[model samples]
Target: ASKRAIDANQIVNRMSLDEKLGQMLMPDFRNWQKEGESSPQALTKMNDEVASLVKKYQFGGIILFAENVKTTKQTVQLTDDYQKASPKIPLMLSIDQEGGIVTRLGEGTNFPGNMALGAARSRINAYQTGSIIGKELSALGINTDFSPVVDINNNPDNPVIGVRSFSSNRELTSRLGLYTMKGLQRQDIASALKHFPGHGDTDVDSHYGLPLVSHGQERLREVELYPFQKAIDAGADMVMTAHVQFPAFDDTTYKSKLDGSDILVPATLSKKVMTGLLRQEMGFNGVIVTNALNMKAIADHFGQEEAVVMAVKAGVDIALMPASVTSLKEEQKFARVIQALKEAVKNGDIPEQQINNSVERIISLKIKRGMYPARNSDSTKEKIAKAKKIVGSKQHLKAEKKLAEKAVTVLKNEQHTLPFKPKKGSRILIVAPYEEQTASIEQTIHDLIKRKKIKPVSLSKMNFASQVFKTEHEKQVKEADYIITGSYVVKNDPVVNDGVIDDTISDSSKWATVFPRAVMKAALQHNKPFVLMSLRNPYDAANFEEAKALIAVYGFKGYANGRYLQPNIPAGVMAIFGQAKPKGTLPVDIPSVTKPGNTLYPLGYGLNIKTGRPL
Candidate 1:
């Protein structure tokens, strides 16, 4: 941002062919654990072999997932080791850090994720979430963050991007996403706005099958592409392409490695989308990176070497997770991928000029991120202590808790049944999708009852998200004076053959509706007051119209030991007892259970407690 183009040009000119080729690939050592050390499966820290791999490949960056991180000190330790191996240039250590369900750090603040922010609808909250996340990542030596997902969660049926996106409204999505990016920039962290050209409206998971949107130009620009457009206009630093195909942009077909049948290519590999639309039409000068090439959307259809070559042809500056990096045999495969790219350039299959242009953009980004100039400013001990002072500091955690509390949307309150007050010995039955979440609810209830001076009550908890039995659970429900249930649903992208879902085995939403539905039924049959919390996809709230109160918590961030790690679950419980007044509005329209396309509750609908009102 501060005129680093000249510096980047000089650096790119000095790069050898191998260095440039490696710079185009951002590999993931996300899930490998060293042999016979602790779990031995944890890849939290670098090993000699992997360090040598980074040095040999000169990989531009490395991405980490939860498996690669466990604690603050360890996380920073891992990044420091990687930088040590990259003596010439500091590796652009990256993480999802998207907050909510997509967090990579084991102990970092999971701030109720994207949909929660969408519902909370505070620009400052979004910015602070971004800033806090940025500072935390930077403390751990992570320079690039794939965050501030700009995908509009308009389609209720969308699987992967539901809670990850900001809102269905293009204006809200754009505004919040932009604010979050500013927060990251304030911390000198590069923000990568993801799933470009929109992954929000599709029901398919790119990790399982390729998704294609048939939207025409008008609809595409109006909803799907609006956020990316706004981000680009606001000077975005990076845009990550999706595996979904946009027929509106390109109709070209490529042969699938599964067979010789020509299939419509995804946007990441489509020149009309990546180069034509993103670069030329939208005028985005930022670096363009492909989503993980190992995802089924690309890996199943295109060979590793073949896919990287195609993405480069499509104008992608980086091929993220282009090849496996765990096994020795797989590392050999990665070298071949680099070799294949060189061959493509030498043969004029992909122009050398294109390589130079992409590398320059990549180098420019690194320079802007301050990763170009080699520096060892602190000892490992000093770095760890510094990171510990910031990552999940009390101040950061307190802010995260407030964000989750603000996101507990109240969709319905029949007969003003909320603000329930339990008697000295009232019976309360709690049910949720995870044991951890149930624990969170239980802890919150007890904590509030004591702090708020409410008498003790009979309590029973169930983990329906994991296991549910109607015959047994009904008995538990009848004994309770009040019932609380939550659902966590994720769409399963079906097994697709040649772009067609195999009807027989095309499974979607691994978490079935039966468990929560059964709990609701028992509460209704017993004439008991019940509240429904839609923990993942807010659309599930529509199915429980009979709920005395309906809530969309977005996610139960987590509850590990005794503390409520993220306060979404606790926030819901607090709302039930009228301890905390919910201020969140619905981010996406809730589809009706009775009518096919009807919305049960439109976006921006949330009822304050009958007596409680917003400030």
Candidate 2:
């Protein structure tokens, strides 16, 4: 045997069962923090408590969220402290900085998301984006990014992974995803290709309930399995599991069978999916991490201890963010999981070899990543300082703006109504659609005022579902020289507790139920020309085909961990005024509402104003 393999074995021999079990558990800091304190302060102040837990259990890794991110300085110090508190075996510090919709770190460079890169159709940009993200992450004392989603978004109704995926085309998805992974690996930051066996075709979000993929093996191997296979072939270091169940893979593999016969086990809890298919058939030998176990798919269906144990037995190397045990204080959830795991192994419910296998893999990953036992804070401090300087630099922001500008797609320019440079005294009605996260169109109005010298009247309070337009709102649309409105449609839970998906007009009820429909209705009624800017879902164009102009910027205001990041509204506004040109093509088909299941606009459809003209 090689000396390195032998070394890992000897290290495992010296470790206790609790330590080994701890090496496989990945939990969030939010579960352990005290009430009514900021995340950074709470984590910093609770160092002793954290240290004791770390020492007792030897945690494998910790995932950071937006709560833990207040400032770059705080995040760097917190991550450094996390390393200091954990046992010497170098924990895997991770975050979901997947730009666009899901960003964990509050201060890093927020680039155009995967779909935007897809729209630009440049693998080089994909590599650059990954390299930029990797550099910023490595600077922050973080080593792992749960990014480059790699899920091909074929279903327009996919709730969680709409704009997050690169493209629906398998070959393009594979090429761009591999390029991104290569960029991250080059920076020594590990990339985890996620939501395995694919979460693309499902209509339901796993955070709410288990989504069952009814595709047979042949279909999955053709579409869903293609990208993951390519990533693994390209040497991906990690792959995250989805809470989704594929009937073709395994029809029966649940712990509780809580949701009845239709509810097959999730990939996170299925041995066939994780071990039999992923490891054996697909030949992925890297770490397999389960999506946060605290999500409703697992938490609502199974108990915390059993669910975690099931994941380990299912061949997952990491049990990410298990629900805290209710009987014990939330602070002791880590301890509870460690003890439960130890008991499971001791009681013969779980084989000891499984724990060893996982520990060896975890330790091997740490070793490969060059994460040795920590001793020096000076170097850590230096790197953190360097990170602060490099992250969100003017250079990086300029790159983001360029990419954002390139990503803006012009799908329908009926009668060449765009390049709308209205006369200085003319009134432009700016309909600012209300968003649950961040109101998007205010900056568009502001930019229009500054650049075009137009007098803009804004209608700001119009909700999408329930339309309530005052008499003054109707009067302005009639007299306005031009109407500029932004549509921010995304697949989201309309109500926090309700399971209904209410982001698109395809549902029909949302058209009347939401407020934006009436706003569009009023704008279309006037003989005045209207420019529709879709900041999120491109498919919204299908319903509003009657508009004079349609533009797709592919993103809106993004809220990371419930904190707001400024939307790229200015990019769309700049494109509309012909100051900045739209270079992006549609990456996916914009489906029609009337046609039911067909595309209204095919992929790669776009136009640019500045391409032929000299500056």
Best model per lDDT: 1
TM-score (C-alpha, index-matched) for candidate 2? 0.86
Instruction: Indicate the worst ten consecutive residues by lDDT in candidate 2.
Output: 492-501
What does the lDDT read for residue 615 in candidate 1?
24
TM-score of each: 0.90, 0.86
Best by TM-score: 1
- In model 1, the runs with Cα more than 4 Å from the true position are 31-40, 203-208, 374-376, 450-452, 465-472, 489-527, 561-565, 595-597, 610-615
Candidate lDDT values, in order: 0.80, 0.73
Q: Candidate 1 has what TM-score?
A: 0.90
lDDT by residue for model 1 (131-223), tens: 999889888888999988998877665555788888888999999999999899888888988888888776453433677788888999998
Alpha-carbon RMSD of each model: 5.1, 5.4
Displacement of residue 282 (Cα, Å) in model 1 is 0.9
* Angstrom error at residue 359, model 1: 1.6
Q: How accurate is candidate 1 locally (lDDT)?
A: 0.80
